Write a protein that binds this ligand. Structure first.
Ligand SMILES: CCCCCCCC/C=C\CCCCCCCC(=O)O[C@@H](COC(=O)CCCCCCCCCCCCCCC)COP(=O)([O-])OCC[N+](C)(C)C
Ligand SMILES: CCCCCCCCCCCCO[C@@H]1O[C@H](CO)[C@@H](O[C@H]2O[C@H](CO)[C@@H](O)[C@H](O)[C@H]2O)[C@H](O)[C@H]1O
Ligand SMILES: CCCCCCCCCCCCO[C@@H]1O[C@H](CO)[C@@H](O[C@H]2O[C@H](CO)[C@@H](O)[C@H](O)[C@H]2O)[C@H](O)[C@H]1O
Ligand SMILES: CCCCCCCCCCCCO[C@@H]1O[C@H](CO)[C@@H](O[C@H]2O[C@H](CO)[C@@H](O)[C@H](O)[C@H]2O)[C@H](O)[C@H]1O
Ligand SMILES: CCCCCCCCCCCCCCCC(=O)O
Ligand SMILES: [Zn+2]
Ligand SMILES: [Zn+2]
Length: 281
């Protein structure tokens, strides 16, 4: 409904409000209060931090999920959608020609009734986005969007620049209140700002770190909480092909584009290199 669609944006409104208020706070008040050359230097650094935050946040929010291609879709009519075991055999015969090595716990082919999709490996259905999403990490209320194959790099860059911004604001307010305490000048209310920054920082520390873990090992959140099932059973490392190539699968080979939110991730969204094949030519 209209109500629901409005309510889905409130986390984004909250983060955007906190960020804009921190901008207004630092730029005028705090930057003025703490040499002209120094002030301009720090104002331009702060502005670069701000622009990278908004850049990465925007592309995290507004990059739609990647979706399985036609080859993975069943083009059935409403009539044909009907006996379950014949469907099982049909899906098996189709999967004979698809690069799908993961199965359900029962061993069945993973299939989405809503999208009519033979799910690729690492693809999962999001009921919020209401679509199958390739290498879906998780649906994020905070970016009002799925985080997966298409935007994961933008998400991690957004966490990083969020952290840098938090450190900038926190350190600035600390210096302001120290200089007040040493009588070299207060705006007591901006103390709250510090308490906010700190909080977010520490939160990001747990989040960033966690994702570091995931990215180091080529593991999605869903996979971390439910290991994928292969022909020989569950395997927590089925897609782990080494730290370097795990990192480059997300950030690409070109160092210049690592820290900017332009799409640079490797592979199609469907087949992902098996750890078990990592030394096969
Ligand atoms: C671009 C980023 C990449 C950079 C390189 C990354 C280097 C490598 C990074 C990390 C490798 C370090 C591995 C630590 C494992 C310790 C042992 C341990 O706890 O075992 C436990 C798992 O362990 C965890 O659950 C870890 C949780 C992560 C918390 C945040 C710390 C991240 C480290 C921050 C690093 C920041 C480095 C600085 C980054 C600039 C137990 O295992 P289990 O029983 O199988 O768990 C089942 C849980 N289940 C129930 C949910 C299924
Ligand atoms: C917790 C801290 C509680 C402090 C209340 O927050 C404080 O509110 C007062 C009340 O105007 C503001 O006070 C401000 O306006 C007053 C006059 O109204 C002026 O002396 C001055 O421009 C400034 O101090 C402070 O800038 C703010 O720090
Ligand atoms: C016992 C039972 C058991 O509250 C606080 O009020 C102050 C003062 O009004 C506002 O203060 C505001 O105005 C002042 C100008 O005067 C500026 O510093 C700034 O624009 C802003 O801080 C704060 O934004 C608000 O957080
Ligand atoms: C403060 C920073 C906290 C950092 C913690 C990062 C991990 C939390 O991340 C979130 O945790 C929940 C715990 O409910 C995970 O787990 C949740 O989803 C999975 C899969 O749908 C379920 O199997 C699980 O039982 C459920 O709890 C989510 O998949 C993950 O998105
Ligand atoms: C007052 C200083 C700045 C405070 C605001 C800084 C920006 C913090 C934004 C953190 C958002 C984290 C979103 C996590 C999403 C997820 O894990 O699904
Ligand atoms: Zn689906
Ligand atoms: Zn979603």
């Amino acid at each position: 409904r209209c109500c629901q669609r409005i309510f889905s944006w409130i986390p984004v409104i909250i983060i955007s409000s906190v960020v804009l208020w921190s901008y207004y706070a630092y730029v005028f008040e705090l930057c003025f209060v703490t040499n002209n050359l120094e002030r301009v230097t720090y104002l331009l650094i702060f502005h670069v931090c701000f622009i990278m935050f908004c850049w990465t946040y925007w592309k995290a929010i507004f990059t739609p999920p990647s979706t399985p291609t036609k080859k993975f879709h069943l083009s059935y009519t409403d009539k044909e959608r009907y006996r379950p075991e014949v469907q099982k055999q049909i899906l098996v015969d189709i999967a004979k020609k698809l690069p799908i090595f993961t199965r359900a716990q029962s061993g069945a082919i993973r299939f989405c009734d809503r999208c009519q999709v033979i799910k690729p490996d690492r693809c999962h259905h999001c009921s919020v986005c209401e679509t199958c999403v390739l290498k879906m990490d998780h649906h994020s209320p905070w970016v009002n969007n799925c985080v997966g194959f298409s935007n994961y790099k933008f998400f991690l860059l957004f966490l990083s620049y969020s952290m840098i911004y938090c450190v900038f604001i926190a350190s600035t307010v600390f210096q302001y209140f120290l200089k007040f305490w040493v009588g070299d000048l207060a705006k007591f209310h901006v103390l709250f700002l510090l308490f906010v920054a700190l909080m977010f920082f520490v939160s990001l520390m747990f989040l960033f770190g966690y994702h570091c873990w995931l990215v180091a090992k080529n593991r999605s959140t869903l996979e971390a909480f439910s290991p994928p099932v292969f022909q020989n059973g569950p395997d927590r490392n089925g897609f782990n092909v080494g730290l370097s190539k795990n990192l480059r699968q997300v950030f690409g080979e070109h160092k210049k584009l690592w820290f900017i939110p332009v799409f640079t991730s490797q592979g199609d969204g469907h087949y992902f290199p098996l750890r078990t094949l990592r030394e096969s030519e």
